[PDB]
Every structure is written in C-alpha cells, then in structure tokens.
C-alpha cells in the first residue's frame, strides 16, 4: 500500500530488526560457537545459541543507518573568500577548482565506500563582514564553469555574461541560495578511490585527480566598487540525494594532508597519529 | 500517455539515440564506404558497416541538444549604468536602444540560425554601489517605450506616468524583477540575418538594423535626490522560451565589432583573429 509505506516513512519504521526468541538449555554435538575465521566468513551465531534467552519484541529500525541517511546531511565543502583590501578590481572575484576533498568530515564518510553515485544539493551561506562600517547593497554572482568553458580573468570578463553556463545571483537580505545537480560523471559512479594513472610514464598522475575533474566555481561581487571595504565569505554546503555506494572500506585512520590522494604523515611517535589510545597493559580496562 | 511523457521529461529521456547492432564480416560489391560528396549529401554510413560491431543498448538522450535547451538559458544582454556624479537630475535616468547584439555569448548562439521565433523571459539584476556610504531607500522604474511612444527627457518627464507603456517598479531588498514577453515581430520570425536594405540608394541602411527595431528601455531612480551618491548598475538577462529556429549557419569565427552587422576586423597576422591554432605540419598531432 503506497499509503501504508507512507506511514512507515513518517514513523521511520521501514527497516525493522528481528526479534530475539526464547531459547533453551542444549546438549548437542552441533557447536554453533565454533567455526573458522580462515574461511573469511563471519560466524553467524546469534544470542539464542549461546545463552538461554527470553522472547523480546524488537522495536528498533535501521532506517537512519541507511546509505541515504548516512550521506544525506549537508556539510561544508568549501569556504570562498573575497576580501577587499586595496584593489577592488583584483579582489572582488575569485575561482575554485571544485572537489569534495578539502573538508575532512564529509570526505571521510564518502571514502568509506569505493564507488558512489548520487545527485547533489548545494546550499550557499554568504556572509558580508563590514570592515569599514557599511555593506551597502551586496549582490553576488556564482558561475559554474565546466571544464573547457572560458574562465574569467577580470571582474568584467565577457564570461560573466553566462550565456550558457549556469549562474546564481544572490542578493544580500534574501534567503540562502540552493540548487540541485544531477549525477555528473562520465562513468556510472564517482570514484572515491582510483588505483590508476592518466598515462604510463614516471610522470603520469596517480589517483582520483585523474577521474574526478568537476570544473571551476567562479564568483564575483556583482556590485561595483563601494566606499567601505567588505569581506564576503561564502561557505558551500553539499549533500548527496538518491544515493548508492559500493564496496565498503576501512575508515580514514590518520589526518588527511592533500586532495585526491591518500598520502599521510607520521610523527616519531605514531600513537599520536591515530585515534588508538595506548593501553597500560592487556588487562587494564 | 500524458503521464508516461511526464516521466520522460523528469528523466530527460524524450529523444533517445539508436542502438549499435552486432555486425559481421562482409564481402560484397555493395560498398557503403564509397560515395560522392559532390552530390552535396553526407554519406549515411554507420559503424556497423565498416567494422564488426557488438550489440550495445544506447542510453544517451538528445533532449539537452534541443533548440529549446540550446537557446533556453538566461544570459546577459545589457549592463545599464546610472552613476550619480555631480548632477542628480541629469544622471538619475537613462535609456537604451534595445537589441540582442551587444553581448557576444548569447548573440553567437542565436546567430547559428537564420530565423528564430520565440517568447522572451527578461530577468533584471540591479546592484546599488554605495559611493559615499549609505544607499538610503532605492526604488527603480524600468519603462518599455515601444517605437513611437514619447521618450522621457528629464527625470520628471510626463512619460514616466506610464499610462499605457509597461513599467516595472523594483524596490531594493525585494527579489529580482522578471517578466515574460510574447513573440514581438511584425513578421513570422525574427531575422538573425537580413540581406536587404530600407531603400534602393547608396545611402540606404543594410542589415538587421532595418528589421529589428525593438524600441527603447528607459529607466530612472524613482527615489528623489539623496545626500550620498550611488551608482546603480542594472544588468538585463534574456532567455528564449517556446523556440523555433530555421536554416542553420556557420558559427561566428571572428570577434564581433558592431551591432546588427557582420562586419569584422583583421590584423596583419590573421591566424590571431580566429580560433584556429597553427599546426607545425600535417603530421604533428
């Protein structure tokens, strides 16, 4: 029933966990507790097999643990800065090589999978800091320049015309801009990891930088030069919608150091580089 | 099914491309690869005819390549400037001889066709620059003066009454103004090109300037003179809706120089005037 399924959505009871059944004392040459991890399989033994359990009706649901839920929360992926210091023409516009690798929090979650396919919801939070007192009338322009399209080199470059590229104009005082993006890859899924190169020589590039080009996000303060200088910081937030992930992997155990690469750094005392806390000894809880 | 067609719109699978079928080795006196370009026709040979192909189910769609899509993106066509410098009465209003010829990006796309018929969506992005600090309360008036209607000559001209002409009043702080326009020509389609004159003498005008008169866009700062001077720049954006185009033509290969004319300039080294990049020789990729 499309209506019964609706209720499960509102109550978040789409994926229920099984009940625990009453079990009894046993004496048998069938020993569930014994197995062989060498097989590479996980022993599927349940509590009813190792102790005498009572009957319990489970009410927990796995909804929130779904991939859609795990990767469906908007997190910051970039903090763009336009700081008017001493030259409006040079400082009133900028560009960013788009990627989901600069902020650790959302990066780590996506990287818990090898491949992921999803649509995106981008939400922007612009904030104008009044360095000299007033902010006047601030209007911003954000333009997506796909790889190949001309990148503006001045605040009045013809590229800002955006005759084809998508641009979003935001006016200070209006609500936060937001839009959706369809799955953008030329492949069937995004590579979270890529053990390959863009060539076969000692100078070929390695990693996702080869497969994850997303273009450039160009932005400028549309408003022409004003007496009082401002510093506009636009924070970009990303969220995955209609998600699918494949081949789960170990979580990032050390701090990230660069984009598109798994490189890391180690100190002379490695226990400081991982979340593992040194134990006094084997028997000290 | 008006509902099945709906799904195709949401998924953008209205225009699907054909599949590639498995082909086999051949020996025949029917030679598809041979033809005669002199005929003026393009050889309709497909991959299955020149190599042994496998069967492949195509999933690409031509939706985005439609004329509606190609010309249906809002681009800048004008940047109106009202700059209060030393005389509010003279500098608080202006006028523009409307045309889609001043900005190269959208102009080039329309000019890839000889004739085009479409409705228009105009969106305005006004931005008030605080030259002295404050911007007070800025209210703008944009009035469309069709050819023949009286053009205001002062900020208080009776024409601003707009008793018949359409006017749009925008208040700073409110969302960007926008409105639609129906196909405006006295002909069945707009001329992107016109090999004709408005007379038969050495002094008759040539080109689209003869057929594309669209009137004047007059604008003024409604707000009366304020202590602090501002500079209001209103950028006009245009988009075609419900579009039809006829007789495709070669894309503009050199920079535009003027409106309503195909005139161009050449330097002493023409390779610098076109996108063609000089090749070292015939065999250097």
């Amino acid at each position: 029933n499309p209506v019964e399924r609706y209720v499960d959505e509102v109550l978040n009871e789409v994926l229920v966990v099984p009940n625990i059944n009453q079990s009894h004392p046993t004496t048998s040459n069938a020993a569930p507790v014994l197995d062989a991890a060498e097989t590479g399989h996980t022993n599927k033994i349940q509590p009813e097999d190792t102790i005498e359990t009572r009957y319990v009706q489970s009410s927990q649901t796995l909804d929130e643990m779904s991939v859609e839920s795990f990767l469906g929360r908007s997190g910051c992926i970039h903090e763009s800065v336009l700081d008017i210091v001493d030259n409006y023409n040079d400082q009133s516009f900028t560009k960013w090589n788009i990627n989901l690798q600069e902020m650790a929090q959302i990066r780590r979650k996506f990287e818990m999978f090898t491949y992921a396919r999803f649509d995106s919801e981008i939400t922007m939070v612009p904030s104008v800091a009044a360095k000299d007192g007033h902010i006047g009338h601030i209007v911003m322009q954000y333009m997506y320049v796909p790889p190949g399209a001309p990148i503006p080199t001045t605040r009045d470059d013809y590229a800002w015309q955006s005759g084809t590229n998508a641009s979003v104009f935001w006016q200070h005082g209006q609500p936060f801009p937001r839009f959706s993006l369809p799955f953008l890859s030329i492949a069937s899924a995004y590579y979270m990891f890529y053990d390959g190169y863009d060539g076969d020589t000692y100078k070929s590039r390695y990693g996702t930088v080869v497969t994850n080009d997303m273009g450039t996000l160009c932005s400028r303060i549309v408003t022409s030069e004003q007496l009082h200088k401002v510093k506009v910081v636009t924070r970009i937030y990303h969220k995955a919608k209609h998600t699918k992930a494949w081949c789960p992997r170990p979580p990032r155990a050390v701090q990230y150091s660069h984009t598109h690469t798994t490189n890391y750094k180690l100190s002379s005392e490695v226990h400081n580089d991982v979340a593992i806390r040194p134990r006094t000894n084997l028997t000290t809880v | 099914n008006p509902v099945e067609r709906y799904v195709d719109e949401v998924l953008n699978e209205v225009l699907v491309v054909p599949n590639i079928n498995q082909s086999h080795p051949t020996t025949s006196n029917a030679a598809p690869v041979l033809d005669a370009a002199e005929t003026g026709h393009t050889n309709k040979i497909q991959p299955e005819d020149t190599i042994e192909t496998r069967y492949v189910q195509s999933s690409q769609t031509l939706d985005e390549m439609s004329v509606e899509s190609f010309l249906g993106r809002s681009g800048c066509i004008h940047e109106s400037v009202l700059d209060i410098v030393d005389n509010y009465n003279d500098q608080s209003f202006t006028k523009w001889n409307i045309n889609l010829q001043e900005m190269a990006q959208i102009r080039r796309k329309f000019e890839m066709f000889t004739y085009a018929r479409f409705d228009s969506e105009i969106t305005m992005v006004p931005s008030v620059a605080a030259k002295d600090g404050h911007i007070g309360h800025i209210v703008m008036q944009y009035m469309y003066v069709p050819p023949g209607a009286p053009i205001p000559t002062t900020r208080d001209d009776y024409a601003w009454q707009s008793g018949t002409n359409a006017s749009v009043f925008w208040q700073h702080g409110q969302p960007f103004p926008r409105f639609s326009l129906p196909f405006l020509s006295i002909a069945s389609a707009y001329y992107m090109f016109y090999d004709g004159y408005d007379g038969d003498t050495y002094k008759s005008r040539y080109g689209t300037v003869v057929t594309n008169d669209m009137g004047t866009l007059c604008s003024r700062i409604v707000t009366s003179e304020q202590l602090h001077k501002v500079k209001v720049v209103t950028r006009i954006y245009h988009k075609a809706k419900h579009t039809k185009a006829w007789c495709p033509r070669p894309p503009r290969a050199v920079q535009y120089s003027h409106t309503h004319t195909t005139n161009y300039k050449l330097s002493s080294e023409v390779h610098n005037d076109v996108a063609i990049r000089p090749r070292t020789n015939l065999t250097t990729v």
């Binding site: 029933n1 499309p2 209506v3 019964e4 399924r5 609706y6 959505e9 789409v14 994926l15 909804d63 779904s66 859609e68 839920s69 469906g72 649509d119 995106s120 959706s180 993006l181 369809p182 799955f183 919608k241 209609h242 998600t243 | 709906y6 719109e9 949401v10 998924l11 953008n12």
Partner: peptide, 29 residues
C-alpha cells in the same frame, strides 16, 4: 506531478520541478 494515493488517507508525493535531481531524499530499501 503528484503520486496521489488513497486509503481516507490520500498521500501526495509531489515533484515541484521537472528534474529527478530536484526531489528530496529517497525512500528506503
């Protein structure tokens, strides 16, 4: 663009824009 259900509990799954990318979070399983 509404997937109207009935039961009376009439569900109204509405898609405001004509692109699949535009809709909210997906359903589970």
């Amino acid at each position: 663009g509404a997937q109207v259900s009935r039961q009376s509990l009439n569900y109204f799954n509405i898609n405001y824009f004509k692109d699949a990318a535009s809709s909210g979070a997906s359903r589970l399983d």
